[PDB]
Paper text:
In the case of SARS-CoV-2, the spike (S) protein forming a large homotrimeric complex at the viral surface is required for this role. Each RBD at the top of the complex can adopt either open (up) or closed (down) conformation. Further, we performed cryo-electron microscopy (Cryo-EM) structure studies of the spike–Fab complex of three representative antibodies.
All three antibodies can bind to all three RBDs in the complex. We compared the structure-defined antibody epitopes with the structure of the RBD–hACE2 complex to determine how many residues in the epitopes lie at the hACE2 interface. Thus, the representative clones from Bin 1/2/3 were studied by Cyro-EM in the antibody-spike complex and the data showed that they all contacted with the residues that mediate RBD-hACE2 binding.
Numbering used by the authors:
A (entry chain B): 1 to 122
B (entry chain A): 333 to 526
C (entry chain C): 1 to 105
The structure:
């Protein structure tokens, strides 16, 4: 039982940056690989990147240039700062979680939690 | 006898990549280093403070445990006053380092048949590192005259690179889990004793 | 990257039926594929992990099989609540790739 709830701005301006924040309750960031994915309206899911609790991150090569994932264990939350926003990023974003069991590599996402909408236009 | 928690420090399922090495504090507990020294399952156990046998009789005020995963080749770099890509861009010990280093092979765990993709190391940095320095920002590296302007390109590089940990690789290219214990004495009552 | 391909772009049937979804890869993915479902207006769930195991809390009417570069996810007995878009996904190499979805009506 990991209650996961996103909270980010619902509208940004073109060419600036957006910053969503994922909050976890009943959840132990202490060992799971946490990741963000996005869904354009009527398209498939796009993975963005995953972040360990220490600071070990890893980003999608297509989006490697302009993303920034941060983890704050004390306030047990995530920041996803995407810069150089274009019209192509109009999409919902999800805050997934690894399932657990592994050694040195993540697993399938498990605990998506309700995804919030992000509109980027004028 | 409330023993120190070396368990989840050495026996954890996952270690962070070398460029964001874990730093876990150890204090206000009694540490039984003998079982570590007598474990006999450690590929490398090199000490630069006092001899490993004696330190069980020596007491400190803080024990930082910094953990990560590296290649077998770079294992030598983790030592006071060493030079190399790991010892200037990712993690380097001060010369007067007061503590010592454990490491063991883990190819059974941290490598993939297709090659592991999770562990990353900082390939380029515009300067060397201070002692016990931890840098995770990953702005694009400007290896040429032009400013990369926040986008990759000709002689612009992403400052992190992924080890291809494959199980059949040579011992030089195998994944080794590494722990570094720094024992520091500050002007405070020593709490980590034998 | 990696290319997932789901054979059924769309599908329909009646209650209590057995339906099969084929996910084919662009290269070798040993067992590193998971099956999610998504009902409209909801975050996707997890159904099958490592291409063979049914995840805890899921009714056993689902199943999965395959290896190499091809896998199948099958509903032995369809139900009225199984209306959803289904996605295979790999985690064997970066980036993680999600299938373009199979609508089930
Ligand atoms: C890790 O677990 C093994 C399994 O029992 C145990 O023998 C070993 O002592 C543990 N490591 C430490 C540092 O206690």
């Amino acid at each position: 039982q990991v209650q996961l709830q996103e909270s980010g701005p619902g509208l940004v301006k073109p060419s600036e940056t957006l910053s969503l924040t994922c909050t976890v309750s009943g959840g132990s960031i202490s060992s799971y690989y946490w990741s963000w994915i996005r869904q354009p309206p009527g398209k498939g899911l796009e993975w963005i990147g995953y972040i360990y609790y220490s600071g070990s991150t890893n980003y999608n090569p297509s989006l490697r240039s302009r993303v920034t994932i941060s983890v704050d264990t004390s306030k047990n939350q995530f920041s996803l700062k995407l810069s150089s926003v274009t019209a192509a990023d109009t999409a919902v974003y999800y805050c997934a979680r690894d399932r657990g069991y592994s050694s040195g590599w993540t697993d399938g996402f498990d605990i998506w939690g309700q995804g919030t909408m992000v509109t980027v236009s004028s | 006898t409330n023993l120190c928690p070396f368990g989840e420090v050495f026996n954890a399922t996952r270690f962070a990549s070398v460029y964001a090495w874990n730093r876990k504090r150890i204090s206000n507990c009694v540490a039984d280093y003998s079982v570590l020294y007598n474990s006999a399952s450690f590929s490398t156990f090199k000490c630069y403070g006092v001899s490993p046998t004696k330190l069980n009789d020596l007491c400190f005020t803080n024990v930082y445990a910094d953990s990560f995963v590296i290649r077998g080749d770079e294992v030598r770099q983790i030592a006071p006053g060493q030079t190399g890509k790991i010892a200037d861009y990712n993690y380097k010990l001060p010369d007067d380092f007061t503590g010592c280093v454990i490491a063991w092979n883990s190819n059974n765990l941290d490598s993939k048949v297709g090659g592991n993709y999770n562990y990353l190391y900082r390939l380029f940095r515009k300067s060397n590192l201070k002692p016990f320095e931890r840098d995770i920002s990953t702005e694009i590296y400007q290896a040429g005259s032009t400013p990369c302007n926040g986008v990759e390109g000709f002689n612009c590089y992403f400052p992190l690179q992924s080890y291809g940990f494959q199980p059949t690789n040579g011992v030089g290219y195998q994944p080794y889990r590494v722990v570094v214990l720094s024992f520091e004495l500050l002007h405070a009552p020593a709490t980590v004793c034998g | 990257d990696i290319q997932m391909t789901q054979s059924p772009s769309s599908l329909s049937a009646s209650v209590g039926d057995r339906v099969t979804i084929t996910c084919q890869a662009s290269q070798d993915i040993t067992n590193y594929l998971n099956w999610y479902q998504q009902k409209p207006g909801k975050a996707p769930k997890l159904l099958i992990y490592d291409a063979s195991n049914l995840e805890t809390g899921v009714p056993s009417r689902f199943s999965g099989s395959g290896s190499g570069t091809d896998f199948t996810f099958t509903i032995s007995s369809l139900q009225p609540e199984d209306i959803a878009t289904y996605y295979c996904q790999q985690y064997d190499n970066i980036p993680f790739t999600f299938g373009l979805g199979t609508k089930v009506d």
